[PDB]
Design a protein around this ligand. Structure first.
Ligand SMILES: Nc1nc2c(ncn2[C@@H]2O[C@H](COP(=O)(O)OP(=O)(O)NP(=O)(O)O)[C@@H](O)[C@H]2O)c(=O)[nH]1
Ligand SMILES: [Cl-]
Ligand SMILES: [Cl-]
Ligand SMILES: [Cl-]
Ligand SMILES: [Cl-]
Ligand SMILES: [Mg+2]
Lengths: 129, 204, 1017
């Protein structure tokens, strides 16, 4: 006699790389960088299509601050003020809903982290090719 | 569905900066005084579904007060702000609270002591007791360092939905497009590269 | 757009359009809502908008429209009432009263339009503040009379009376003159006997209705001020503590009332009143136990569930019990028939203290502090509370929060990480918990030890193992250092450290190890008395910290370095002596192995290590031995320095790659760290590097200027130039640090100062603004502070080099160059304090700029700057007065006395500098008292404007009267005259002078202020 007992959309992706970062977007009108979020930047590879995107969420709120394919045509360039950041143009990011173009800057805790990011970024671009 | 939140407090306490941080992620360093009120929708994803706050960010400067307590009508929750580096802003908390509860008699209210990132703190933790008899929730916050920045909205969401176990959750991450106007001109990039990132001494 | 129509006052107001604009604002969104808002604000702010109010109130079908109509009237009543002709005042009163009566008589409106009614009531109270009782003597009798005619009206009258009491007693201090506040308080007091009669009657004849709640809400406000006889000589306490506690509708407000009763001013020699105070508490506690929850209830769980109003109730219960017991527990402590009541009340507090809610915990903890501090001193009391205190030990021990020293924490992924930010809130909570646990330990040291040891047992065997449990216990163990005997402590600490060390070896993984390591470090750092008595233990502990400096966890490394410092501050003697059965002092071993020990530390951590060595070395007071220790300590940075100085001077420069700049910065930072702990003892090391360091400062400065010239101002943002500026900043910091602690000031003056000024001053002056380091100003402030009196010509040089050029950086707005701003006024303050003669040597045009700069400072909202500006002004006036009757002082007054008076008045009265009120008032009083006391020996007036022989007293009053008349044209001449008469008569009594200034600040916000207000006491 057994007694009757008491009654994200990232699921199909692999994490290739994760790093803590601060993301900025450039305001051309104001001519200034504006913070978009701080948290883990992940490179996620779709298991079916093998395509690699950047997905970044803010600490605590978990809100998306970056969501775009690591396009082969993108290039990481240095910012004049920093040895631990990269700037690049993105033509289709959907963090805020509708596809929108941005000039991003992403900054890391150290030059080493920035350099490892660049390596992983360009690897992801090759996978996407 | 949605809840009206009124944000009140002295001029310069960081009300608009706090809201902007939540809206866009940015930290506005400039003080541009709010004129009357600025209304902003703000959505959080929780384990009980999305919650939308309609944030009425009111003016703290008397000269720019606009409709004053007229903004409070039909508010369902509130945040009262002060600046822990300015004693006068804490002195004025009972005045904001008086004006607010006279219009909104039984709403959940968070009291926030902002700018706790600043070294020379003037309103010490032990001085802050006004919330006790008024049944206000209290948090030390910093819009600059983001210390406790989520807590006021989490507490209000728990009170408004009536679920103490409610938590923020990761919003759905839809697949992003591919976008290969072939000869588009981006000297915009050189401007961006040659404009220094702010706060280069921060940890990040 | 169509919405703008309501702004055209030439046409009759279209009420339907107004209602549309209002609906769009409140219920709409986006651009249309924004447009509507702006239009409503313009409408409201139109000075004739109040003429529409009656029409809007009569014709509108939108409650918000009517609310806005009342706001418009509120603005008129509170600022311009006395300008209106009398029939408009009678008219506004009449229709506000009529609207309220009308709304109350319609049951449907009374139920559904509470916001509008409450707003109408507040508007009536604004009229009462202007008119009552002098032009409305029958208000209270008619209010009482009307209350019997209708329950809605009676209820609404309680709202009106509540709001009146608030405005008169709770919020009058800032909003009314002293005279008007006193007039209204006296007026309410004279009619309260009949207000109370009505209140008590309503309370007697009902149970839990909306009328009863409204009445109790009014009573809550009355309890702030009414005489105790209304509470103790009536049956009101019985009603509050029995009847109104039974019904949940009335329970919340009644509990708040009983909390305020517990604060009434009450005779202390009266056995009857003491019985009544006991009885209401007994009744209230019985009602809680029977109607709400028994003493045994799990309040932690109840609060967590957050049903209905349970959280607010438990908060309010905490406030009631803590308030009453802190005042009255002695009434319950002697009578054996009251013991159960006393202990039950405390048992509810114990249960409340288990609730997971930080702010509520702080409230209960404050009470526990009050209790245990009393039990510590008061004879024969602690035994009463022995069971309460034993439970409290457990509660505190189980809920200890993270001390400042514990630099590891668990993130949201459950990973042990280095703390991102210091938590001032939790730091203060830890200290509060420590204070209470320290008292509790003293009250029963055996109980405390037994609780901690039995908990420790369940961590070793794994039965209660968790990060939370090992952390709280370890923090508690560390927190009670000092409470045990040396022998009991010895056995205790030995056991704890032994078991924690065993736990560290036993548990697996980087996370577990980091947690236990942090706990070991917290505990050892808290028991220096033990370590000092036990060298072999101390030595082993230090070797353990050195092991932690090799861990891959940066938080553990950080804490190891900080703990090293914390131990060394207390135990340094034992590192300097040669200990029995050792071959050398441990400091020599430490220094020899420093490269090995610090190999895996980041630079900042290495500097902390050197700082700790500096603390130890300054324990050696024999100079030859100490200087040799210092030389030994600095061998590595000095060797690195010598080769960089060779490189830099043999190849100047074209050799400052980024790595070299980092090396140089870290050498200087190492020197700063050691100088911080050694202070005056650092001089020989400073001497070793000084001249080459200043040469390096010059070389770095040249490179920075060259980079800016070749690359633009943007160069200052580059890693290269930021790195070079770090070198300059750290050099300035080293010199500042040394001079701030120097004991031989003669050497500072003869050896250090001239080369410093030569190296830094022209460089600062001759760089572009974006390349100037604020740290130069900071360094000079310390130079002037410490040796300014010995270098008058050096102080003049400092002024010449930094004054005009820094002023020009900061005088275009209040925001640019924030650090220069702050350091500039700190420097001017110290020069004005210590070397005033330097200002006397300025040419008149420059001295004018100095006065300009001071006045500029007190217009800042930035507190740092504002406060220094007001202080420099006060100090300057005192400096001038100290000179007596001499040309410079006479000319100062003729040129600047009225500038200082007017500028001080401006910031006092502009409503944008309220934080500086006290210092503004002090400055104004000083200025006025100079004339009052005939301390200005020349006429302040020009020969033409006033009859010769006219006193400065008469001219000052004339000048001020004219100034105020033009600045505040809405004041009558009599207001201005009376204000100035009072202010001048009161210039030797700051508290009263300030009161008169506050009265003036109230009067300038309205029309028709009573000039006799300035005769107040
Ligand atoms: N250091 C620090 N500064 C802050 C913080 N939050 C805001 N500030 C600063 O404080 C200033 C005033 O901010 P703002 O948000 O405009 O204040 P407000 O309360 O909206 N003013 P108003 O009522 O007049 O509209 C800004 O310069 C902003 O950068 C903080 O957490 N820390
Ligand atoms: Cl302050
Ligand atoms: Cl309304
Ligand atoms: Cl010692
Ligand atoms: Cl007059
Ligand atoms: Mg604002």
């Amino acid at each position: 006699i057994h007694f009757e007992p008491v009654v994200t959309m990232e699921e199909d992706e692999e994490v290739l790389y994760k790093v803590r970062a601060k993301l900025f977007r450039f305001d051309k009108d104001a001519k200034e960088w504006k913070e978009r979020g701080t948290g883990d930047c992940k490179f996620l590879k779709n298991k079916k299509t093998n395509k690699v995107r950047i997905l970044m969420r803010r600490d605590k709120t978990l809100k998306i601050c970056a969501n775009h394919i690591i396009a082969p045509e993108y290039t990481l360039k240095p910012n004049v003020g920093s040895d631990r950041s990269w700037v690049y143009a993105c033509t289709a990011d959907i963090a805020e809903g509708e596809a929108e173009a941005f000039t991003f800057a992403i900054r890391f805790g150290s030059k080493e982290n920035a350099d490892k990011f660049k390596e992983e970024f360009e690897k992801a671009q090759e996978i996407n090719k | 569905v949605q809840f009206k939140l009124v944000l009140v407090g002295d001029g310069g306490t960081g009300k608009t900066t706090f809201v902007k941080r939540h809206l866009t992620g940015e930290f506005e360093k400039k003080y541009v005084a709010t004129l009357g009120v600025e209304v902003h929708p703000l959505v959080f994803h929780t384990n009980r579904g999305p919650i939308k706050f309609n944030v009425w960010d009111t003016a703290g400067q008397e000269k720019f007060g606009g409709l004053r307590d007229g903004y409070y009508i039909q508010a369902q929750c509130a945040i009262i702000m002060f600046d822990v580096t300015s004693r006068v802003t804490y002195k004025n908390v009972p005045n904001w609270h008086r004006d607010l509860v006279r219009v909104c008699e039984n709403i959940p209210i968070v009291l926030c002591g902002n700018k706790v990132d600043i070294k020379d703190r003037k309103v010490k933790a032990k001085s802050i007791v006004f919330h006790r008899k008024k049944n206000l929730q209290y948090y030390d916050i910093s819009a600059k360092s983001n210390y406790n920045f989520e807590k006021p909205f989490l507490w209000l969401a728990r009170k408004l939905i009536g679920d103490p176990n409610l938590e923020f959750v990761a919003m759905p991450a839809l697949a992003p497009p591919e976008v290969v106007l072939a000869a588009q001109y981006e000297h915009d990039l050189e401007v961006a590269q040659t404009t220094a990132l702010p706060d280069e001494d921060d940890d990040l | 757009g169509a919405m703008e129509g309501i702004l055209d006052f030439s046409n009759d107001l279209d009420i339907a359009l107004l209602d549309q604009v209002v609906s769009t604002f409140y219920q709409g969104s986006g651009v249309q809502q924004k447009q509507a808002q702006e239009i409503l604000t313009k409408f409201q702010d139109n000075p004739d908008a109040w003429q529409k109010a009656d029409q809007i109130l009569q014709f509108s079908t939108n409650p918000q429209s009517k609310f806005i109509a009342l706001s418009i009237l509120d603005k008129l009543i509170t600022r311009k009432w006395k300008l209106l002709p009398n029939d408009h005042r009678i008219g506004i009163r009449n229709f506000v009263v009529g609207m309220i009566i009308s709304m109350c008589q319609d049951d449907e409106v009374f139920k559904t339009q509470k916001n509008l009614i409450n707003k109408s009531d507040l508007t009536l109270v604004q009229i009462l503040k202007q008119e009552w009782p002098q032009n409305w003597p029958e208000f209270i009798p008619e209010l009482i009379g009307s209350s019997s005619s209708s329950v809605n009206v009676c209820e609404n009258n309680m709202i009106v009376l509540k709001l009146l009491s608030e405005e008169v007693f709770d919020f009058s201090a800032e909003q009314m003159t002293q005279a008007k506040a006193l007039h209204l308080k006296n007026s309410m007091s004279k009619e309260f006997e009949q207000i109370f009669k009505l209140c008590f009657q309503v309370l007697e004849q009902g149970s839990s209705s909306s009328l009863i709640v409204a009445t109790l809400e009014s009573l809550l406000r009355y309890l702030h001020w009414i005489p105790y006889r209304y509470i103790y000589e009536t049956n009101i306490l019985e009603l509050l503590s029995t009847k109104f506690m039974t019904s949940p509708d009335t329970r919340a407000i009644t509990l708040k009332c009983l909390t305020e009763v517990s604060n009434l001013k009450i005779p202390q020699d009266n056995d009857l009143i003491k019985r009544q105070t006991v009885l209401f508490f007994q009744n209230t506690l019985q009602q809680i136990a029977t109607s709400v929850m028994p003493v045994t209830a799990d309040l932690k769980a109840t609060y967590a569930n957050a049903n209905g109003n349970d959280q607010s109730f438990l908060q309010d219960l905490a406030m009631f019990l803590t308030t009453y017991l802190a005042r009255n527990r002695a009434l319950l402590e002697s009578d054996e028939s009251l013991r159960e009541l006393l202990l039950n009340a405390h048992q509810y507090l114990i249960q409340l203290s288990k609730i997971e809610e930080r702010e509520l915990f702080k409230t209960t903890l404050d009470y526990w502090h009050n209790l245990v501090a009393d039990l510590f001193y008061e004879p024969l009391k602690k035994h009463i509370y022995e069971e309460i205190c034993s439970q409290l030990r457990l509660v505190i021990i189980e809920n200890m929060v993270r001390p400042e020293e514990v630099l590891v924490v668990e993130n949201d992924e459950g990973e042990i990480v280095r703390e991102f930010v210091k938590e001032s809130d939790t730091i203060q909570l830890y200290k509060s918990e420590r204070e209470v646990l320290v008292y509790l330990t003293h009250l029963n040291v055996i109980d405390t030890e037994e609780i901690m040891i039995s908990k420790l047992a369940r961590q070793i065997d794994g039965s209660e193992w968790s990060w939370h449990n090992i952390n709280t216990l370890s923090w508690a163990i560390g927190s009670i250092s000092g409470t045990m005997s040396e022998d009991t402590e010895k056995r205790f600490v030995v056991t704890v450290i032994k078991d924690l060390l065993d736990l560290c070896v036993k548990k697996r993984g980087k996370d577990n190890k980091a947690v236990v390591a942090s706990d070991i470090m917290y505990v050892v750092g808290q028991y220096p008395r033990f370590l000092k008595a036990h060298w072999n233990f101390l030595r082993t502990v230090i070797l353990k910290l050195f092991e932690f400096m090799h861990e891959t966890h940066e938080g553990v490394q950080d804490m190891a370095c900080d703990t090293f410092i914390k131990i060394v501050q207390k135990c340094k003697y034992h590192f300097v002596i040669q200990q029995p059965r050792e071959s050398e002092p441990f400091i020599q071993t430490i220094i020899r192995d420093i490269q090995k020990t610090t190999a895996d530390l980041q630079p900042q951590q290495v500097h902390t290590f050197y700082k700790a060595c500096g603390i130890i070395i300054s324990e050696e007071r024999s100079v030859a031995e100490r200087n040799r220790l210092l030389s030994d300590l600095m061998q590595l940075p000095n060797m690195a320095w010598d080769t960089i100085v060779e490189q830099s001077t043999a190849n100047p420069t074209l050799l400052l790659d980024s790595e070299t700049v980092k090396i140089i910065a870290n050498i200087i930072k190492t020197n700063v760290a050691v100088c911080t702990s050694m202070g005056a003892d650092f001089y020989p090391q400073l001497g070793h590097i000084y001249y080459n360091m200043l040469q390096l400062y010059r070389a770095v400065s040249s490179m920075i200027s060259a980079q800016v010239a070749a690359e633009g101002l943007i160069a200052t943002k580059t890693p290269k130039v930021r790195g070079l500026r770090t070198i300059k900043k750290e050099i300035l910091k080293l010199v500042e640090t040394y001079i701030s602690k120097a004991r031989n000031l003669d050497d500072v003056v003869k050896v250090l100062v001239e080369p410093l000024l030569n190296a830094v001053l022209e460089d600062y002056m001759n760089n572009v603004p974006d390349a100037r380091d604020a740290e130069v100003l900071n360094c000079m402030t310390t130079v002037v502070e410490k040796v300014g009196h010995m270098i008058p010509q050096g102080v003049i040089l400092i002024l010449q080099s930094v004054f005009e050029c820094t002023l020009d950086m900061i005088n275009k707005d209040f925001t640019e160059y924030p650090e220069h701003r702050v350091e500039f006024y700190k420097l001017l303050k110290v020069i004005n304090e210590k070397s005033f003669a330097a200002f006397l040597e300025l040419p008149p045009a420059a001295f004018k700029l100095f006065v300009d700069a001071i006045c500029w400072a007190f217009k800042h909202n930035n507190r740092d700057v504002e406060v220094n500006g007001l202080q420099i002004a006060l100090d300057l006036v005192k400096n001038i007065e100290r000179m007596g009757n001499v040309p410079f002082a006479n000319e100062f007054h003729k040129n600047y006395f009225f500038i200082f008076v007017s500028e001080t008045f401006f910031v006092l009265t502009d409503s944008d500098h309220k934080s500086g009120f006290s210092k503004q008032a002090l400055l104004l009083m000083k200025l006025i008292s100079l004339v009052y006391d005939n301390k200005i020996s020349v006429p302040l007036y020009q020969e033409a404007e006033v009859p010769q022989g006219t006193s400065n007293q008469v001219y000052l009053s004339q000048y001020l009267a004219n100034m105020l008349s033009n600045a505040f044209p809405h004041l009558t001449s009599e207001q201005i005259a009376s204000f100035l008469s009072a202010l001048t008569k009161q210039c030797k009594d700051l508290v009263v002078f300030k009161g008169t200034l506050r009265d003036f600040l109230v009067q300038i916000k309205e029309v028709g202020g009573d000039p006799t207000d300035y005769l107040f006491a």
